[PDB]
A paper describes a structure:
Here we show that Psb29 in Synechocystis 6803, like THF1 in Arabidopsis, is important for normal accumulation of the FtsH heterocomplex involved in PSII repair. To gain further insights into Psb29, we have determined the crystal structure of Psb29 encoded by Thermosynechococcus elongatus, a thermophilic cyanobacterium widely used to study structural aspects of PSII assembly and repair. Each Psb29 subunit consists of 9 alpha helices.
For preparations in the presence of protease inhibitor, the only crystals obtained were of needle morphology in P6322, which diffracted very weakly. The P6322 form was soaked overnight in 1 mM 4-(Chloromercuri)benzensulfonic acid sodium salt (Jena Bioscience), but this was not used for phase determination. The B-P21,I222 and P6322 crystal forms were solved by molecular replacement with Phaser using the A-P21 structure as a model. The most complete structure consisting of residues 4 to 206 of the predicted 222 residues of Psb29 was obtained from P6322 needle-shaped crystals containing seven copies of Psb29 in the asymmetric unit, which form a continuous cylindrical shell of protein in the crystal, with the C-terminus of the protein forming a helix extending from the compact protein fold into the middle of the cylindrical protein shell. A striking feature of Psb29 is the presence of a long alpha helix at the C-terminus extending from the globular protein domain. The first 3 and last 16 residues could not be identified in the most complete crystal structure, possibly because of structural flexibility or because of some proteolytic degradation. In the B-P21 crystal form, the new carboxy terminus at residue Ala189 is clearly visible in the electron density. It is likely that proteolytic cleavage of the C-terminal helix allows more compact higher resolution crystal lattices to form, as there is insufficient space in these lattices to accommodate the C-terminal helix observed in the P6322 crystal form.
Author numbering: 4 to 206
Write the structure that this text describes.
């Protein structure tokens, strides 16, 4: 068994540099949430989990500086969680084969009993997480027809063909989009205030 302090020690090991605190509170939450996930007995690694982690990281790290470190933090935190930094980016990028597919055909591939990978991962998720809802959000994003706009209307269509707790998927995605709105509002506040530090020190 491993400990939150041990997993944190692992991140503070490979990442000995400062953590650049605007997105810090999210990194700590992502560190502990993933730890509490994999240490659970029913957790199963899946490309749906991989898509959700990479989607949550890329969108929540909007404008991370310096840019060269955002991929190194991704590299260090993965092994810190005993994950694979390359296997996660491969699984997350593997969903691109569904770009432009209609939602009707996606439902057909699930209803046939033989869904292809990584779409097959919707059944073998294992222990549910908020990150699994984010992975579904990123998958439904790239589909054809702007299926994300009326998200609840889409999730109710998936409910009978998916084993996921749709009502918990609705909630965690609304919590996800509300949090993403706060960081971009804060990141835009940095751009509004970093010019006041750059255009007034040289004024
Ligand atoms: Hg990671």
């Amino acid at each position: 068994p491993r400990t939150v302090s041990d997993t944190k020690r692992a991140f503070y090991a490979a990442h000995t540099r400062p953590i650049h605190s605007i997105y810090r509170r999210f990194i700590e939450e992502l560190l502990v949430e993933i730890h509490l996930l994999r240490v659970n007995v029913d957790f199963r690694y899946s490309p749906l989990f991989a898509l959700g982690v990479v989607t949550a990281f890329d969108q929540f790290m909007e404008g991370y500086q310096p840019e060269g470190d955002r991929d190194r933090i991704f590299h260090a935190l993965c092994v810190a969680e005993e994950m694979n930094p390359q296997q996660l980016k491969e699984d997350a990028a593997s969903w691109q084969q569904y770009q432009g597919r209609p939602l009707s055909q996606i439902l057909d591939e699930l209803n046939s009993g033989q869904p292809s990978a990584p779409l097959n991962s919707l059944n073998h998720t294992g222990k549910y997480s908020r990150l699994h809802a984010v992975g579904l959000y990123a998958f439904l994003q790239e589909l054809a027809g702007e299926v994300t706009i009326h998200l609840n209307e889409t999730l109710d269509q998936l409910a009978p063909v998916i084993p996921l707790p749709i009502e918990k998927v609705k909630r965690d995605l609304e919590l996800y989009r509300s949090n993403l709105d706060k960081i971009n509002q804060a990141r835009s506040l940095m751009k509004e205030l970093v010019e006041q530090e750059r255009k007034r020190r040289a004024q």
